[PDB]
């Protein structure tokens, strides 16, 4: 059990977080997955007040409300559980907070959730915001910087990761500060592709590869897992693992990343 940190996004709208723990290495019995990501909470907008607010749909809330059975078991296994935040077509996004005050208010909701439900961190996925909807402004230079600065200040010992996509991802500097080193990980958003995140983080914390379990061919899965190890990258991003039998799809990257087949319980 040595090798790249494998990440697993799970669409909690349809699937349980618990499948992530079902795969172990036939060699040593280590976890096939090191980080599980709850996908996902949203950034909504209150037009009347012109303020954004964090929002969990009924499915996201169910797993959170049920943390003890859906989350703790992964954590007791040694698997880190993060919560991903994504746009929700309301004009409000991570890149258009009008002020440091507004940004910090949103950061607080995220850190409060992490603390409340016993999470290991937050993940930013800047897609679907639709900047401009509801009289909102387009992305700016300070918003994302203000947001990450605030989030890191109040939760210093947690994981902060970035889905390398959307306006925010390319807005890491403002004032005199680069929030690059405030993140722990950053990864390629395009499944079935290689794409080295441009963020100034060391290879140990970057995942140029992104695959969708059950959709990306095992040929491309193994190929990217191989390149990840060869080129010296420390992370391997996986998405949409479900409850069906995915042992061969998982073994396809574990053979390359950890030199072991995967096994399912």
From Swiss-Prot:
Its EC number is 3.2.1.96. It comes from the Bacteria. It comes from Streptomyces plicatus. Keywords: Glycosidase, Hydrolase, Signal. This is Endo-beta-N-acetylglucosaminidase H. Residues 4-260 form the GH18 domain. GO terms for biological process: carbohydrate metabolic process. One of its GO terms (cellular component) is extracellular region. One of its GO terms (molecular function) is mannosyl-glycoprotein endo-beta-N-acetylglucosaminidase activity.
């Amino acid at each position: 059990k040595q090798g790249p940190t494998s990440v697993a996004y799970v669409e909690v709208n349809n699937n349980s977080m618990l499948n992530v723990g079902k795969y172990t290495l036939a060699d040593g019995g280590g976890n096939a997955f090191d980080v599980a990501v709850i996908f996902a909470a949203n950034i909504n907008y209150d037009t009347g007040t012109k303020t954004a607010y964090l929002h969990f749909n009924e499915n996201v809330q169910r797993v959170l409300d049920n943390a003890v059975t859906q989350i703790r078991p992964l954590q007791q296994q040694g698997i880190k559980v993060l919560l991903s935040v994504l746009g929700n077509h309301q004009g409000a996004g991570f890149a258009n907070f009008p002020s440091q005050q507004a940004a910090s208010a949103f950061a607080k909701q995220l850190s409060d959730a992490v603390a409340k439900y016993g999470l290991d961190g937050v993940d930013f996925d800047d897609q679907y915001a639709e900047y401009g909807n509801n009289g909102t402004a387009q992305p700016n230079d300070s918003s994302f910087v203000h947001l990450v600065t605030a989030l890191r200040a109040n939760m210093p010992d947690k994981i902060i990761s970035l889905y390398n996509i959307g306006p925010a991802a390319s807005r890491l500097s403002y004032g005199g500060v680069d929030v690059s080193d405030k993140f722990d990980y950053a990864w390629n958003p395009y499944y079935g592709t290689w794409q080295v995140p441009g963020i100034a983080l060391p290879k140990a914390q970057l995942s140029p590869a992104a695959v969708e379990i059950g959709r990306t061919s095992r040929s491309t899965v193994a190929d990217l897992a191989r390149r990840t190890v060869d080129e010296g990258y420390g992370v391997y991003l996986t998405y949409n693992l479900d409850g069906g039998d995915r042992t061969a799809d998982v073994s396809a990257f574990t053979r390359e990343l950890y030199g072991s087949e995967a096994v399912r319980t």
